[PDB]
Amino acid sequence: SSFSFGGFTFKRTSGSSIKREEELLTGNLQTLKIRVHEGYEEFTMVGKRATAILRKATRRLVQLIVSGRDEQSVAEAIIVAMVFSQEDCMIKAVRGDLNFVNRANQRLNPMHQLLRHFQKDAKVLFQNWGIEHIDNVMGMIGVLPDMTPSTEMSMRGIRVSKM
Numbered sequence: 001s002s003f004s005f006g007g008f009t010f011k012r013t014s015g016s017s018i019k020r021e022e023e024l025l026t027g028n029l030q031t032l033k034i035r036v037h038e039g040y041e042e043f044t045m046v047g048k049r050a051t052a053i054l055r056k057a058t059r060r061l062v063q064l065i066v067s068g069r070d071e072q073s074v075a076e077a078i079i080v081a082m083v084f085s086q087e088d089c090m091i092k093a094v095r096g097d098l099n100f101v102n103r104a105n106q107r108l109n110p111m112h113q114l115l116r117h118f119q120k121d122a123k124v125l126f127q128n129w130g131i132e133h134i135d136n137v138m139g140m141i142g143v144l145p146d147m148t149p150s151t152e153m154s155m156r157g158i159r160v161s162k163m
Ligand SMILES: CN1CN([C@@H]2O[C@H](COP(=O)(O)OP(=O)(O)OP(=O)(O)O)[C@@H](O)[C@H]2O)c2nc(N)[nH]c(=O)c21
Pocket: 001, 003, 004, 005, 012, 016, 017, 019, 035, 037, 038, 041, 084, 085, 086, 109, 111, 112
């Protein structure tokens, strides 16, 4: 896999997956027909303003370690990764109906619907993601739902490091 999503390039460095189509419902009772990936995979994400290592399994973000130019740039990468992971809690974070369209009046695919939704506002996504205690070693630091750094706690699986 060498591809892109949410304006970041992803390069799979280990693992693999089967796509398996599932219909998932949002709190607004919308069906999203989503090609759910199955298996355990690691990627390097590279954007112009942030890079990250993403480890994930089936509908689960195991770890993301992000290096970004600044706080906005780190958030952007975290949102893309939270959507990419296909997590239940990201789907449950959706508020209202998703009807985004491309500059040619076609519906964005469902993964892009989710992404465009959270790029507009990520408060509910980050608030419902989950918090964990962290070891704070090797220069990894945590990031809280309001993007404040913490050496004690972080959004689950999310670390920030410039090393
Ligand atoms: C969640 N994803 C998404 N993804 C890939 O990310 C790329 C961008 O997704 P997209 O443009 O929404 O999908 P599209 O091109 O319509 O294909 P698809 O319908 O397979 O998502 C696709 O190549 C898709 O396979 C993935 N690739 C791997 N290896 N593992 C994964 O978990 C995922």
